[PDB]
Design a protein around this motif. Sequence first.
Motif, short mmCIF file in Angstrom:
data_model
loop_
_atom_site.label_atom_id
_atom_site.label_comp_id
_atom_site.label_asym_id
_atom_site.label_seq_id
_atom_site.Cartn_x
_atom_site.Cartn_y
_atom_site.Cartn_z
N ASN A 11 36.52 45.22 35.55
CA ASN A 11 36.44 43.80 35.90
C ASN A 11 37.38 42.98 35.02
O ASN A 11 36.95 42.03 34.36
CB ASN A 11 35.01 43.30 35.76
N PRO A 12 38.67 43.31 35.00
CA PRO A 12 39.58 42.63 34.07
C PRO A 12 39.97 41.24 34.53
O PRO A 12 40.14 40.34 33.69
CB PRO A 12 40.78 43.57 34.01
N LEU A 13 40.15 41.04 35.83
CA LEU A 13 40.63 39.74 36.30
C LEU A 13 39.60 38.65 36.07
O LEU A 13 39.97 37.48 35.92
CB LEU A 13 41.04 39.83 37.77
N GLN A 14 38.31 38.99 36.02
CA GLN A 14 37.31 38.00 35.66
C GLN A 14 37.50 37.53 34.22
O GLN A 14 37.42 36.33 33.93
CB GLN A 14 35.91 38.56 35.86
#
Lengths: 50, 49
Positions: A11-14
């Motif tokens: 969940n990096p883009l969060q």
Amino acid sequence: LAEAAATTTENPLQKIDAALAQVDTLRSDLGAVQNRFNSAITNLGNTVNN
Amino acid sequence: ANDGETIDIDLKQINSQTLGLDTLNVQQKYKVSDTAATVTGYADTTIAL
């Protein structure tokens, strides 16, 4: 000094979005204070003239 | 443009072996037969004279 992760991020883009949120919050505040400064300049000019 | 929203494509391993077609054989066993043969001559050997 920070570690190097041994596994791929999840969940990096969060996290990136939250980061950007912090950035824009700080940018907005730093912009806003300039309004205080401008109005203070105006009032100062009026005061000196009077 | 968000974390996790994806389209998933699914595949298979496909070739003669995976389909088992290597096990296909249409041949039928022949009716074998044999006949005598001739053996001739003497061969030399590493044994020294």
